Design a protein around this ligand. Structure first.
Ligand SMILES: *[C@@]1(=O)C(=O)[N]C2=C(C(=O)O[C])[C]=[C][C]=C21
Ligand SMILES: *[C@@]1(=O)C(=O)[N]C2=C(C(=O)O[C])[C]=[C][C]=C21
Ligand SMILES: [Cl-]
Ligand SMILES: [Cl-]
Lengths: 187, 187
């Protein structure tokens, strides 16, 4: 039974933070569903790359649950994730079932908006720290990837490979992550 | 006058190697055109990410020339680039005008196919070395990014940020590359 990942893709998502985890997770044999927040139509990312989702979120929700729910960053993408009742319900269900929740850059701020994972150690992009920390509901970390309880976070486009490989390690183990990593020519 | 980049997007392109340079170049204020080899329709990349190009290559060619032509990798994408008469004409024109040509992973093998930049020092993905070196028409390098004459090459998904930033440095200078790099949270 392959592990399954839900990647929620909103207008304004950071395309690197979307594509790097999708691709690396697929390299790891994870079944990844790129689900469009708004519907089935193509999504204009933060730097104007347009990505066609595999499915609407509405439809993807019905094939749940997933081994990981992944929230890319991009400030405007994260804001859209933060405003979504659908995302709230998906994250609450994932938390209740003790499933992995992964978020990068400003993505973790959607966890705050939806009251997910309070008390966890988290990281964010440096410029998203104050937003994430409003209320002191999390403990802040400067690690490039952080993992506490159910919650796996990371900092930016430049930590996206590390974030992706951490998700792979969590789901498929250290040996698979190492196998996937070698051909990428990471430093 | 902003610099302009042509990124040629074929079926089977490595989506990370496409998106990372597009995004980082746009961060640098470069006007980037993602041009579909096959036409205007969406492109299924190597790990099934589907990207909608900005324009067909046919149409983008008419708005040339560009400060850089960028060839992503992905083995099947590179093979498609290698087989294309349109790509041949674009690279020959770019070489003749002494413009930058950039290619990553197996992307440089399209330079071989089209007889571009012979005698240059180049790198590739390690698994694409023998193909690139058939005939000894280039000198091989293990540098993560290499630049000789007109030709800027790089090795893999994991060198895509370095490749992109090198393109930025070539076009817009070292200070802009440094400015663009800082918010990415690269190691
Ligand atoms: C990142 O992709 C994101 O989600 N936010 C972000 C910032 C920013 O200003 O966050 C508040 C800067 C650079 C990368 C990202
Ligand atoms: C890379 O994205 C590419 O273009 N080729 C490639 C290989 C490969 O087998 O090249 C022959 C392996 C890993 C990454 C890439
Ligand atoms: Cl952003
Ligand atoms: Cl490939």
């Amino acid at each position: 039974a392959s592990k399954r990942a839900l990647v929620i893709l909103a207008k304004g998502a950071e395309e690197m933070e979307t594509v790097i985890p999708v691709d690396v997770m697929r390299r790891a044999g994870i079944k990844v569903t790129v689900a469009g927040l708004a519907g089935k139509d193509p999504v204009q990312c933060s730097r104007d790359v347009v990505i066609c989702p595999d499915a609407s979120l509405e439809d993807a929700k019905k094939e749940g649950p997933y081994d990981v729910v992944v929230l890319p960053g991009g400030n405007l993408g994260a804001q859209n994730l933060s405003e979504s009742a659908a995302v709230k319900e998906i994250l609450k269900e994932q938390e209740n079932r003790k499933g992995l929740i992964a978020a990068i850059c400003a993505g973790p701020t959607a966890l705050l908006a939806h009251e997910i994972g309070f008390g966890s150690k988290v990281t964010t992009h440096p410029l998203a720290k104050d937003k994430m920390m409003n209320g002191g509901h999390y403990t802040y970390s400067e690690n490039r990837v952080e993992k506490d309880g159910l919650i796996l976070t990371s900092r930016g486009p430049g930590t996206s490979f590390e974030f992706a490989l951490a998700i792979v390690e969590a789901l498929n183990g250290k040996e698979v992550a190492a196998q996937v990593k070698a051909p990428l020519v990471l430093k």
